[PDB]
Design a protein around this ligand. Sequence first.
Ligand SMILES: *C(=O)[C@H](CCCCC(=N)N)[C@H]1c2ccc(-c3cccc(OC)c3)cc2C[C@@H]1O
Lengths: 10, 36, 259
Amino acid sequence: DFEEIPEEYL
Amino acid sequence: TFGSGEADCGLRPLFEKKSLEDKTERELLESYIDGR
Amino acid sequence: IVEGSDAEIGMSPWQVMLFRKSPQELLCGASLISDRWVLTAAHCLLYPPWDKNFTENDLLVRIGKHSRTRYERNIEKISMLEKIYIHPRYNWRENLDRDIALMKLKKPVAFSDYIHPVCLPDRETAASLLQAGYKGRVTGWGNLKETWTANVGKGQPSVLQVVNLPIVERPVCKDSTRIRITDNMFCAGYKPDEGKRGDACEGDSGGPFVMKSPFNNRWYQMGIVSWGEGCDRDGKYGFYTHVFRLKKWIQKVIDQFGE
Ligand SMILES: *C(=O)[C@H](CCCCC(=N)N)[C@H]1c2ccc(-c3cccc(OC)c3)cc2C[C@@H]1O
């Protein structure tokens, strides 16, 4: 449901 | 140190710091035995 | 939030989203109390009956938000956790007494128009403001309608919602429920007669109950959204962790490291 966040946050 | 830094706490950049009120904060303040 | 409305922008710049990072979901609300410390409910992280047990690497904190589901590209800040602290006497076996937890962020957030900490109360702010009949304010991105009984009528909000609720007398609180109520809790909400409605609901746990002081115009966090039976059910009330009664542990842990 959430928009995709930047992969430096994972 | 001051608080945990702040010190600045609880004053919102877009409201208290510009002397602007939000839409419902009057309801809160009026329940505090109104005040005067 | 049930029967609330949309927050204004920058209305609650201490609101935090607790977000898990696979599957991507909102867990809970939370609040920013300094540049490095977030306050939430312990049950957001740790609840053995339901095999819930999050650690730091399971979670992201998101700060500065308004939209529930958008990545708010030049506005929100996402942060990682370095340490979770739960109250050592949180009572998940019985009644969620001492429902509190501190999170240390890996590195400090910068403040902005959208990101700004709330104050914690002192003795005289607590004494004066925590009185039955006085209204506080609750915010969050939780359900709009009852979900431990999953609902329609709209479901989930697009934007941060707000509701203002009265504190209720301790006897009416204790007489509304079969759960044993402690001094570390208070309840809030409108009575069946009073005409007005409103409540927190699922997805809202962990977030702030705040009041504004009439003496110095600052916002103080008086409670954490903790528990309640249903959402907005008549003759039921929301329960909140009493932030002032647990402030020594808060200080204790942010003084011990404390760096
Ligand atoms: C958190 O998101 C959610 C709801 C908090 C707001 C509820 C409200 N004010 N109506 C959590 C919730 C709610 C209730 C319980 C519960 C019910 C009865 C007895 C309990 O033990 C004391 C708990 C549990 C929870 C966990 C949800 O995450």
